Structure formats: C-alpha cells, structure tokens
C-alpha cells in the first residue's frame, strides 16, 4: 500500500545544565529505524531495526554528521529565537522539527513535509507545493525571508522528490519481511459489571501493525460515538499496537451492541458481540 | 507558555497470566514541555531496571514516551506508574489494571 | 536517509 518516511527532531535548552539536549529519531511507517541522542556517551546515529543494520560504515558516518550538525544549528536557532520573541536567557525552550515523504503503492511521491514548532506552537512550515512557506507569526516571517533568500525550499523539494523517495523505496525492499506485512488485530469483547443496572462492554484489539485502526460500538446499528470510551492507540513494545473501545450498557441490552473493527490487515471489517 | 498534561496508560505487553513473565508498560503521551519523570512501582516501591523509548512527538507536537520493564505478575502484587510533570501539583499514580 | 543542508532560522 502507501508508505511514509519521517525524521523527528527535538532540542530542549536547559540553562545552567549544559548545552541543549538533542534527540532525533527516524521512522518508516510506524517502525523506528534510527536514533541519535546528544546525551549518549559517544553520540552516534544508531540502528533500531534489523533491515538498516546492513548499511555500511559510510552510511552511519554520514547520518552521524548530519545529526551532529543539526544539533549545532538548533543551538544557534534557540539563541536566535530568544531574540525574536524578546525572551530571557533563563528559561528552558523547545524546538521541534519533522520532515519526510509519503509515497503511494507505486512508490511515487504523494506529498512531502518540513515543518517546525517553537515551545510547542507552529513556527514555520513548508507548504504542500514544496516551494512556499507558511509562517505562524512575525518572528517566523523573519526566518521565512531568510529561507526565501537562501532558497531553502528548492533544496528541500529536491531532497523530498529525490533522495527521500528513493531511500524509502530501498528501505521498503530491505525490510519487506516486516515493513510490507500487516499484522491483523486479535480481537475479543469483555464484560465488566458496574451495578445491578449497568455493565461495561470493552472491545479489544491487540498485537496489530500498522497502528492505524478503527474500533466503534454500535447500538441497534447506530454509532455510539458520544458514549464510547476510546483509549489512544498504544505501543505493546514488540512493534505491535493495542487499542480498546468501551461502552456502558444497561444490563439485559448487551446484544443490541456490536463492535466493529477495521484494519488493513483484515480482509473484511469485523463485527463482534459479547459472548457470555 | 502552552502546557499540556500527560495522558497515562499502564498495561502489559501480553495478556496477564499469573506466574508467567511479561512486560509492564507505562505510556505517557500528549504532554508539553518534554521534561517528565516516570517511575514503575511494585507494591509502592520503585522498580530499578526500567528502560524507555527515545523522545518523539505526534502531529500536534505533543510528546510521547514508553517506559517498560520485564515483570512476572501475581495475584497479590500491585503494580503502578508514577508520573510527575510541570502541569501536576503532585505526582499522579495510575494503578495497573489488568482489565485496561 | 537524512536531508544534509543546514539552514539557520
């Protein structure tokens, strides 16, 4: 199907406690495959998936250099943004950056990304055209004017259309055993009495990959959206994910409730009911 | 600035079966800023060998982390996750409920 | 693999 590659970066200044911490992680779809942490003992880009380990030493050297260099430019930008926002040097601040590409089933570029946040708020973002910018405020407009003069968007467009897509295709082939395998959820429905009049029906989805999934409860075929407790999809820790949906049901009405499971690893969307 | 308090789920990797080894997970998400303290508790006391994922973040820029440790559940042992964050007037403890 | 250019803000 469709696939994605993303690089995530966070710098967090810590005045009086050394230089800003820099952590960056790379993903293909929902699979972590590289990491760099400026606080590690001998900081290097490290593999986090088996299909990336075969890349040779010059790969790891180039990725290490880029990460270290991005750590340095974030530290300069943190100082710059203190000026742009008229802020004291005493507080901790955060810079986040994500970039990457989505490709369709044929491997062609669907769209690229490159966007920033300062202290958790949108700062500047490359638009879907990969040629213009959206700046969130007059400070980010200063960066916008800098980046337009240095023609940053052209370099990004060349990367996102070229290397991003091509290396994603390479990774997808090398890790096809896992990256191109969908693991359907194992599903069941539990029943948890609350009082003489009420019980909780909880619909479980376990062990699935990728993370995208739909769990819904229906009552007499009508979606219980407002009365359904839906936990955030969560990592099991073994590459797979978990989720549940729950409704509080009048005792005796259990059979009017159906749980519906959509997942790309399922040929047909599933329907299941509480089975006493 | 903007501050967002962490969501907390504590759960096992596999369905819990007393006497059988598992992994205990505490997943904190939705929070900002990134500084956070997360402990896994066994009967009120801090478990020592706890690992955690590398800091990443969701589409809305809020952060998430997985803290985890091997464990073997029993009928009597209580497990929990203790989280402190700038948004919390006091540490929040979420008990491990094998049904959640 | 990563983007190599290093624009400053």
Cα B1 to Cα A121, A133, B84: the distances in Å are: 9, 24, 18
A126 and A246 part of one domain: no
Closest to A34 (Cα-Cα) out of A74, A70, A4, A6: A6
Contact assessment for residue A217 and residue A201, using Cβ atoms and an 8 Å cutoff: yes
CA A51 – CA A59 distance, rounded (Å): 13
The whole domain housing A17 covers 3-180
Q: Which chains touch C (3 or more CB pairs under 8 A)?
A: A
Minimal CA separation from B53 to chain A, in Å: 9
In sequence order, which residues have a C-beta less than 8 Å from that of residue A138 and are 6 or more positions away? Answer: none
In sequence order, which residues have a C-beta less than 8 Å from that of residue A204 and are 6 or more positions away? Answer: A186, A187, A188, A189, A190, A242, A244
CA A49 – CA A132 distance, rounded (Å): 35
DSSP label of B44: T
Nearest residue, CB atoms, B99 vs list A92, A190, A238: A190
Residues of chain A positioned with their CB less than 8 A from the CB of C3: 7, 66, 99, 156, 159, 163-164
Q: Which residue is listed with tokens 């440790």? A: B69
Contact assessment for residue A125 and residue A114, using Cβ atoms and an 8 Å cutoff: yes
> CB of B86 within 8 Å of any CB in chain A?
no
- Print burial letters for A18-54: b (CB count within 10 Å at least 16), e (below 16): eebbbbbbbbbbbbbbbbbbbeeeeeebbbbbebbee
Contact assessment for residue A153 and residue C5, using Cβ atoms and an 8 Å cutoff: no
Sign of the dihedral through C-alpha A142, A148, A150, A154: positive
Cα A176 to Cα A52, A171, A181, B78: the distances in Å are: 12, 8, 7, 41
C9/A77 CB distance under 8 A: yes
- Give the CATH number for residue A16: 3.30.500.10
Contact assessment for residue A117 and residue B33, using Cβ atoms and an 8 Å cutoff: no
A204 and A228 part of one domain: yes
A34 and A165 part of one domain: yes
Closest to A184 (Cα-Cα) out of A263, A123, A105: A263
Q: Which residue is listed with tokens 């596999």? A: B14
CA A164 – CA A26 distance, rounded (Å): 12
Report the DSSP pairing between strands A94-103 and A109-118. Answer: antiparallel
Number of domain units in chain A:
2
For residues A19, A45, A34, B25, the Cα torsion angle rounded to the nearest 10 degrees is -60
A211 and A261 part of one domain: yes
E strand or H helix that includes residue B15: none
- Give the CATH number for residue A191: 2.60.40.10
How many CA atoms, within 13 angstroms, populate the side-chain half-sphere of residue A186?
A: 6
A237/B54 CB distance under 8 A: no
DSSP chain A: --EEEEEEEEEE--TTSSSPEEEEEEEETTEEEEEEETTSSS---EE-SGGGTTS-HHHHHHHHHHHHHHHHHHHHHHHHHHHHTT--TTS--EEEEEEEEEE-TTS-EEEEEEEEEETTEEEEEE-TTSS-EEESSHHHHHHHHHHHHTTHHHHHHHHIIIIIHHHHHHHHHHTHHHHT--BPPEEEEEEEEEETTEEEEEEEEEEEBSS--EEEEEETTEE-GGG-EEPPPEE-SSS-EEEEEEEEEETT-GGGEEEEEE-TT-SS-EEE----
DSSP label of B98: T
Method: X-ray
* Domain termination residue (choose one: A180, A198, A218): A180
The whole domain housing B9 covers 1-100
Tokens of B79: 């497990």
């Amino acid at each position: 199907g469709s696939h994605s590659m993303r690089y995530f970066h966070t710098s967090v200044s810590r005045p009086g406690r050394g230089e800003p911490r820099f952590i960056t992680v790379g993903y293909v779809d929902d699979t972590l495959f590289v990491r760099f942490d400026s606080d590690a003992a001998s900081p290097r880009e490290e593999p986090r998936a088996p299909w990336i380990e075969q890349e040779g030493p010059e790969y790891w050297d180039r990725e290490t250099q880029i990460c270290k260099a991005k750590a340095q430019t974030d530290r300069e930008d943190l100082r710059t943004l203190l000026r742009y926002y008229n802020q004291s040097e005493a507080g901790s601040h955060t810079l986040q950056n994500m970039y990457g590409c989505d490709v369709g089933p044929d491997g062609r570029l669907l769209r690229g990304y490159h966007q920033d946040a300062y202290d958790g708020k949108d700062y500047i973002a490359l638009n879907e055209d990969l040629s213009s910018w959206t700046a969130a405020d007059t400070a980010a407009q200063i960066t916008q004017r800098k980046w337009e003069a240095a023609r940053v968007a052209e370099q990004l467009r060349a990367y996102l259309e070229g290397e991003c897509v091509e290396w994603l295709r390479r990774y997808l082939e090398n890790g096809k055993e896992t990256l191109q395998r969908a693991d359907p959820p194992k599903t069941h429905v539990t029943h948890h009495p609350i009082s003489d009049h009420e019980a909780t029906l909880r619909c479980w989805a376990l062990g699935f990959y990728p993370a995208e999934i739909t769990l819904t409860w229906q009552r007499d075929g009508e979606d219980q959206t407002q009365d359904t407790e839906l936990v955030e999809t969560r990592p099991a820790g073994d590459r797979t994910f978990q989720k549940w949906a729950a409704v509080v049901v009048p005792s005796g009405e259990e059979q009017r409730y159906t749980c519906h499971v959509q997942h790309e690893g399922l040929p047909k969307p599933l329907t299941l009911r509480w089975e006493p | 600035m903007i501050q967002r308090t962490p969501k907390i789920q504590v759960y096992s990797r596999h369905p819990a079966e007393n006497g059988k080894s598992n992994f205990l997970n505490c997943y904190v998400s939705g929070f900002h800023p990134s500084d956070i303290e997360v402990d896994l508790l066994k009967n009120g006391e801090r478990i020592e060998k706890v690992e955690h994922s590398d800091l990443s973040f969701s589409k809305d820029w809020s952060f998430y982390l997985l803290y985890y440790t091997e464990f073997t559940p029993t009928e009597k042992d209580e497990y929990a996750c203790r989280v402190n964050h700038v948004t919390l007037s006091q540490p929040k403890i979420v008990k491990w409920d094998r049904d959640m | 693999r990563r983007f190599s250019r290093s624009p400053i803000r």
